[PDB]
């Protein structure tokens, strides 16, 4: 069938609010393993990677925690190749979406041919020289992008990085807050993206068919879904660090995942940007966490129409 | 025009929470008659059927209140034929969705040629031998289904039942919680169904056109819409006994009904599973009840674009 | 590029609740000017028109404040021609949707060839002789409509009015509460309209393409978008005087505006029916006001996918 390879990643130095490290914990305690098990799958729990804080991690210009971040992605990069090595799907319940540099790295080391689906309200493609806020959780893509190589400077922590995916091989879904420089990158590189504008025009039914035919048209290669919880409307996932209104509906989040699942080409998965601490009432934490589990499971089989052996 | 035949059915022994018997009451007191009247229709209020509790109604295996349930459907079965007999549309504001065995019975006795539209978050097609919870409110379809005859055992209360509708003559809309055995029945019998997955893919616009062309393609026969309030998202109908998230929007519920109305082939209608007692605030009761009325009326003419004589 | 011409219009005598006059104020204080500026546009703030209350404004039959209303539209009519005169888009943050008679007047005086997009949960096409409630905020269209001339009586305050737009030149979007007489006008005149029923059938993607091809098919003429905040669901714009459930989603409101913007044929705009006083919590005021700004800006360039110079 499809074997799962779990990697907990309680990292938060890719952005300001630390709580995001609570993700693996909360995710796990919400009953993620048993639920996957209730389905058809050999869950391999490679545990939570221990990250040793970098004592002297002085900024690169305005970029905070570069080494702290770059190593977490390096550590994670190795691991992710080990699970893809044991012929299993890599499942990364992350902290901040900066780890994406890591996930996609180890995955590519194995399947350099993969295709990416970036579900997120943000592009996360700012470079170390375009970032305004200066947080790394919003620049992962620019490190992975081949056509962007040369645009990216030499930052402490990422000597190891080698651009793996090309502009013609990633698709964005759920975008509604792109920085002026990120938009310039989007249109100039010719990146395929479905902002909330297109989801409204085509509906999620057409959006999914187009993303997948655009990705799996020529060849049937490995798929990597980087999933940022803030891709969905804050009424479904309120406990995120950077939420925007006009997001994807509970149902829309479930359609994407069921459709990706259905192709059976998923090789890598990451569930990012959830921070229970940032939720208002205790139920908003429940609402953001449960919704998160409700999506992971759909990726691994669960369909609203039913299942059976 | 189209004459209405009202039948109140305060039954609840098809499931655990009794409040569902409040439906006819609350429905009526919400001003259902006058509103229908405000439109074009001869409302015939055949009243609320008096159900005498069955003193000794011991379970059939794990199936509770079999006789209590089977007779309510038998009583109701008769009545429903009387209204279809007086050339009127049968309108059943029910209690629990177990009465469906009854509604569809008396209706079929008259128009054995009818077609069914099961709007519900659940299939309600468990047999007396597949039911896990063991409640009858989640097995009505298996009693009505011809291809299922032979699968259904001999249970106290339903000697009278004769499978009326066939697998190729019912359509499910709003499904998102189907039991492992129910799903096996769905796919094996080749039943037409639009789970929330398809509503997301095709949108309600295409879903309605496809359900109706699939049903009314060959011939223009009678239509029976069994409507379970939990078919809609619990933010619109929170006062239900078994609600699921990811449901149908207020607007989507209204589109189905306006489209069914527009065909003018509606012969039977049932509004089930509403239980005011199960609502949190007093307004959630108002929200679930009013939404319910807002759908009934659409079935009988009211259109968001307007009306006039 | 596209120059903006602002006209504040704190008018409320077109309906009962006065607060609607707070619109220009709240709108402005919410940072509307700077935000437009953040984009590409020469904002011309022609200020808030001073309206002198009419001491003796006795009703015309059941029509309250006729002169008070008719002059506000006359005053506004002049002004709107001045901004269209300075080759700028007319932006009218109004009070009650009765001012529409005015906006569309001065605009037409300049571009008698314009096309109209009436986004609203209501048709607002009752005549002085069909109006039941008797409020003018729900009859603006009947004064502007050519085919309706002759149906409209001679009411104090509007001798100046000359029907500018024809039945084949306006489109309604977001309708869900049309009076029996308004519906009769709709169907008889052959007016193009997309009630919530059609938005559900075609989705907003098809709705926008059809409205614009129906309007801009033959010729590429000026566009006037009259925007009533109650066109959207009261969960997005709760602080309105006459809100209805089943409305347009935040996202749907944004799609319309981005699509209208994209044609680059917008010449006139009005943002009506917002009344902060009528909101429950202080945040519902924030929710209704911010949502309003989020739409204005989309009309003038802001796109969820991004922007840049
Ligand atoms: N435009 C923002 C992007 S924040 C992105 C956050 B997240 O990882 O959740 O997408 C910046 O420059 O930090
Ligand atoms: N799978 C559940 C179905 S409960 C159905 C409830 B109702 O009538 O509301 O659809 C069971 O076996 O009882
Ligand atoms: N049918 C109502 C329409 S109220 C319309 C209000 B508004 O301007 O917001 O659309 C009447 O006759 O007053
Ligand atoms: Mn992200
Ligand atoms: Mn994000
Ligand atoms: Mn049911
Ligand atoms: Mn149900
Ligand atoms: Mn209006
Ligand atoms: Mn309105």
List the one residue out of C195, C194, C117, A269 whose CA is nearest residue B304. C195
Structure tokens given for C144 = 């502007």
Looking at the structure of chain C, the number of domains it has is: 1
Q: In terms of CA atoms, which chain B residue is nearest residue C181?
A: B308
List the one residue out of B251, B231, B276 whose CA is nearest residue B28. B276
How far is A40 from B78, CA to CA, in rounded Å?
Answer: 47
Identify any residues that bridge with B173 across adjacent strands, giving them in sequence order.
Answer: B119, B194
Count of CB contacts below 8 A, A vs B?
56
Give the distance (Å) from ligand 9 centre to CA of residue C217: 27
Protein residue with its CA nearest to atom 5 in ligand 1: A138
Annotate chain B with three-state secondary structure.
CCCEEEEECCCCCCCCCHHHHHHHHHHHHCCHHHHHHHCCCCEEEEEECCCCCCCCCCCECCECCHHHHHHHHHHHHHHHHHHHHCCCEEEEECCCCCCHHHHHHHHHHHCCCCEEEEECCCCCCCCCCCCCCCCHHHCHHHHHECCCCCCCCCCCCCCCCCCCECHHHEEEEEECCCCHHHHHHHHHHCCEEEEHHHHHHHHHHHHHHHHHHHHHCCCCCCEEEEEEHHHECCCCCCCECCCCCCCECHHHHHHHHHHHHHHCCEEEEEEECECHHHCCCHHHHHHHHHHHHHHHHHHCCCCCCCCCC
Q: Choose among B205, B254, B306: nearest Cβ to C186.
A: B306
Tally of CA atoms within 13 A in the half-sphere of C8 that contains its CB? 20
Name the 3-class secondary structure at A149. Answer: coil
Contact C211, C262 (CB under 8 A): no
- A274 contacts chain B (CB < 8 A): no
- Find the angle CA(C247)-CA(A228)-CA(A233) to the nearest 5 degrees: 15
Instruction: Report residue C136: phi and psi, to 5°.
Output: -75, -20
Minimal Cα–Cα distance from C208 to chain B, Å? 16
How far is B287 from B293, CA to CA, in rounded Å?
Answer: 10
Ligand 2 pocket residue status of B126, Cβ below 6 Å: yes
Give the distance (Å) from ligand 1 centre to CA of residue B293: 45
Cα end-to-end span (Å), chain B: 13
Q: Which of B57, B74, B96, B122 is catalytic?
A: B122
Ligand 2 pocket residue status of B131, Cβ below 6 Å: yes
Task: Provide the b/e sequence for B113-145 (b: ≥16 CB within 10 Å).
Answer: ebbbbbbbbbbbbbbbebbeebbbbbbbbbbbb
Contact B234, B174 (CB under 8 A): no
List the one residue out of C231, C226, C266, C228 whose CA is nearest residue C245. C231
C-alpha dihedral, C98 to C101 to C103 to C105, nearest 10°: -170
Domain harbouring C252, CATH code = 3.40.800.10
Count of CB contacts below 8 A, B vs C?
56
- Total Cβ atoms within 10 A of residue B168: 14
Kindly tell me the burial class for residue A132, based on how many C-beta atoms sit within 10 Å of its own C-beta (0-12, 13-18, 19 or more). Answer: exposed
CA distance readout (Å), B150 to A90, A135, B145, B147, B153: 46, 65, 10, 8, 7
Q: Which experiment gave this structure?
A: X-ray
Identify any residues that bridge with A8 across adjacent strands, giving them in sequence order.
Answer: A48, A93
- B258 contacts chain C (CB < 8 A): yes
Tally of CA atoms within 13 A in the half-sphere of A308 that contains its CB? 14
Contact C135, C64 (CB under 8 A): yes
Domain encompassing residue A89? 1-309
Give Cα B139 distance to the centre of its chain: 12
Ligand 2 pocket residue status of B138, Cβ below 6 Å: yes
List the one residue out of C39, C47, C46, C32 whose CA is nearest residue C1. C39
CA distance readout (Å), C12 to B233, C229, C233, C269, C293: 38, 15, 22, 18, 20
List the one residue out of B10, B17, B93, B33 whose CA is nearest residue B292. B93
Protein residue with its CA nearest to atom 3 in ligand 1: A138
Contact C226, C119 (CB under 8 A): yes
Q: Which of A73, A104, A124 to mutate to test the pocket of ligand 1 (most atoms within 8 A of CB)?
A: A124
Structure tokens given for A40 = 């058809």
How far is B5 from B42, CA to CA, in rounded Å?
Answer: 8
Kindly tell me the burial class for residue A217, based on how many C-beta atoms sit within 10 Å of its own C-beta (0-12, 13-18, 19 or more). Answer: exposed
N residues, chain C: 309
How far is A250 from A236, CA to CA, in rounded Å?
Answer: 6
Name the 3-class secondary structure at C262. Answer: helix
- B303 contacts chain C (CB < 8 A): yes
Contact C220, C267 (CB under 8 A): no
Q: What is the DSSP string of A78-136?
A: HHHHHHHHTT-EEEEE-SSTTTHHHHHHHHHHH-TT-EEEEESSS-----TTT-SS--G
- Could you give the residue numbers annotated as active site of C? 97, 120, 122, 124, 137, 228, 230, 273
Ligand 1 pocket residue status of A267, Cβ below 6 Å: no
A97 catalytic? Reply is yes
Instruction: Report residue C254: phi and psi, to 5°.
Output: -70, -30
A177 catalytic? Reply is no
CA distance readout (Å), B217 to A117, B110, B204, B220: 40, 21, 19, 7
Q: Cβ neighbours of residue A296 under 8 Å, at least 6 residues apart?
A: A32, A36, A91, A257, A269, A271
Q: Which of B38, B211, B306, B308 to mutate to test the interface with C (most CBs of C within 10 A)?
A: B306
Residue A207's H or E segment, with its range, is helix A196-216
How far is C259 from C253, CA to CA, in rounded Å?
Answer: 10
- Resolution at which this structure was determined, Å: 2.3
Give Cα C150 distance to the centre of its chain: 24
Q: In terms of CA atoms, which chain C residue is nearest residue B309?
A: C180
- Find the angle CA(A206)-CA(C173)-CA(C285) to the nearest 5 degrees: 100
- C250 contacts chain A (CB < 8 A): yes
Q: In terms of CA atoms, which chain A residue is nearest residue B205?
A: A203
Structure tokens given for B127 = 């047999």
Q: Which of B121, B181, B197 to mutate to test the interface with A (most CBs of A within 10 A)?
A: B197
- Report strand pairing: B115-119 vs B223-228: parallel
Structure tokens given for C179 = 């009076």
- B205 contacts chain C (CB < 8 A): yes
Q: Which atom of ligand 3 lies nearest, measured to the CA of C179? A: 1
- Report strand pairing: A266-272 vs A223-228: parallel
- Total Cβ atoms within 10 A of residue C197: 24
How far is C295 from C30, CA to CA, in rounded Å?
Answer: 13
- C148 contacts chain A (CB < 8 A): no
Tally of CA atoms within 13 A in the half-sphere of C4 that contains its CB? 26
Q: Find the helix packing angle between A100-110 and A66-85, rounded to 10°.
A: 30
Say if residue B179 carries a ligand binding annotation: yes
Q: Choose among A186, A197, A202: nearest Cβ to C304.
A: A197
Q: Which of A177, A186, A201 to mutate to test the interface with C (most CBs of C within 10 A)?
A: A201
B230 catalytic? Reply is yes
Instruction: Report residue B195: phi and psi, to 5°.
Output: -75, 175
Instruction: Report residue C128: phi and psi, to 5°.
Output: -65, -15
Identify any residues that bridge with C248 across adjacent strands, giving them in sequence order.
Answer: C232
C-alpha dihedral, B232 to B234 to B240 to B243, nearest 10°: 80
Contact A190, A214 (CB under 8 A): no
Minimal Cα–Cα distance from B212 to chain C, Å? 14
Ligand 2 pocket residue status of B124, Cβ below 6 Å: yes
B250: which chain C residues are within 8 Å (Cβ-Cβ)? 245-246
CA distance readout (Å), B77 to A261, B112, B127, B158: 44, 13, 20, 12
Task: Provide the b/e sequence for A143-166 (b: ≥16 CB within 10 Å).
Answer: bbbebbeeebeebbbbeebebbbe
Contact C242, C203 (CB under 8 A): no
A228 catalytic? Reply is yes
| Inter-chain touch C254–A246, beta carbons under 8 Å | yes
Residue A177's H or E segment, with its range, is none
Place of tokens 């890591």: A102
How far is B140 from B125, CA to CA, in rounded Å?
Answer: 6
A305: which chain B residues are within 8 Å (Cβ-Cβ)? 175, 178, 183, 186, 193, 195, 197-198
Kindly tell me the burial class for residue B275, based on how many C-beta atoms sit within 10 Å of its own C-beta (0-12, 13-18, 19 or more). Answer: buried
**DSSP code for C137:** G
In which order are the strands placed within the sheet that holds C192-195? C43-48, C4-8, C89-93, C266-272, C223-228, C115-119, C170-175, C192-195
Instruction: Report residue B172: phi and psi, to 5°.
Output: -100, 135
Give Cα A107 distance to the centre of its chain: 13
How far is A101 from A226, CA to CA, in rounded Å?
Answer: 10
Instruction: Report residue B45: phi and psi, to 5°.
Output: -90, 85
CA distance readout (Å), A27 to A49, A89, A271, B304, C47: 15, 18, 10, 43, 54
| Inter-chain touch C180–B309, beta carbons under 8 Å | yes
Structure tokens given for C137 = 């905020």
Residue A290's H or E segment, with its range, is helix A282-299
Q: Which atom of ligand 2 lies nearest, measured to the CA of B137? A: 8
- A302 contacts chain B (CB < 8 A): no
| Inter-chain touch A196–C254, beta carbons under 8 Å | yes
Question: Which ligand sits nearest to residue A125's alpha carbon?
Answer: 1
Minimal Cα–Cα distance from A118 to chain C, Å? 14
- B305 contacts chain C (CB < 8 A): yes
Instruction: Report residue B201: phi and psi, to 5°.
Output: -75, -50
Query: Residues within 5 Å of ion ligand 6 by Cβ?
Result: B 97, 120, 122, 124, 228
Kindly tell me the burial class for residue B282, based on how many C-beta atoms sit within 10 Å of its own C-beta (0-12, 13-18, 19 or more). Answer: exposed
- Total Cβ atoms within 10 A of residue A170: 24
Q: Which of C208, C248, C306, C307 to mutate to test the interface with A (most CBs of A within 10 A)?
A: C306
How far is A265 from B91, CA to CA, in rounded Å?
Answer: 49
Question: Which ligand sits nearest to residue A227's alpha carbon?
Answer: 4
Contact A33, A93 (CB under 8 A): no
Protein residue with its CA nearest to atom 5 in ligand 2: B138
Task: Provide the b/e sequence for C275-298 (b: ≥16 CB within 10 Å).
Answer: bbebbeeeebbebbbebbbbbbbb
Q: In terms of CA atoms, which chain A residue is nearest residue C251?
A: A246
Say if residue B57 carries a ligand binding annotation: no
CA distance readout (Å), B3 to B41, B112, B226, B303: 6, 20, 18, 18
Place of tokens 């940032």: A278
Kindly tell me the burial class for residue A205, based on how many C-beta atoms sit within 10 Å of its own C-beta (0-12, 13-18, 19 or more). Answer: buried
């Amino acid at each position: 069938s499809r074997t799962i390879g779990i990697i907990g990643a309680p990292f938060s130095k890719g952005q300001p609010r630390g709580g995001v490290e609570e993700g693996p914990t909360v995710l796990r305690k919400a009953g993620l393993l048993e639920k996957l098990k209730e389905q058809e799958c050999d869950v391999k729990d490679y545990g939570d990677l221990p990250f040793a804080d970098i004592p002297n991690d002085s900024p690169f210009q305005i970029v905070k925690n570069p080494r702290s971040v770059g190593k977490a992605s390096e550590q994670l990069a190795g691991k992710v190749a080990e699970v893809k090595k044991n012929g299993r799907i890599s499942l990364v319940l992350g902290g901040d979406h900066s780890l994406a540099i890591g996930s996609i790295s180890g995955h590519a080391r194995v399947h350099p041919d993969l295709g990416v689906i970036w579900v997120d309200a943000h592009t996360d493609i700012n470079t170390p020289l375009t970032t305004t806020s200066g947080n790394l959780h919003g620049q992962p893509v620019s490190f992975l992008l081949k056509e962007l190589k040369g645009k990216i400077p030499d930052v402490p922590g990422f000597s190891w990085v080698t651009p793996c995916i090309s502009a013609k091989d990633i698709v964005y879904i759920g975008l509604r807050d792109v920085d002026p420089g990120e938009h310039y990158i989007l249109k100039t590189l010719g990146i395929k993206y479905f902002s909330m504008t297109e989801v409204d025009r085509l509906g999620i039914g057409k959006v999914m068919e187009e993303t997948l035919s655009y990705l799996l048209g020529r060849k049937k290669r490995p798929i990597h879904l980087s999933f940022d919880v803030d891709g969905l409307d804050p009424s479904f996932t309120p406990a995120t660090g950077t939420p925007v209104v006009g997001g994807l509906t509970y149902r829309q989040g479930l359609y994407i995942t069921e459709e990706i699942y259905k192709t059976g080409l998923l090789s890598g998965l990451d569930i990012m940007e959830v921070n229970p601490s940032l939720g208002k009432t205790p139920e908003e934490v429940t609402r953001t966490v449960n919704t998160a589990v409700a999506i992971t499971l759909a990726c691994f089989g669960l369909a609203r129409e039913g299942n059976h052996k």
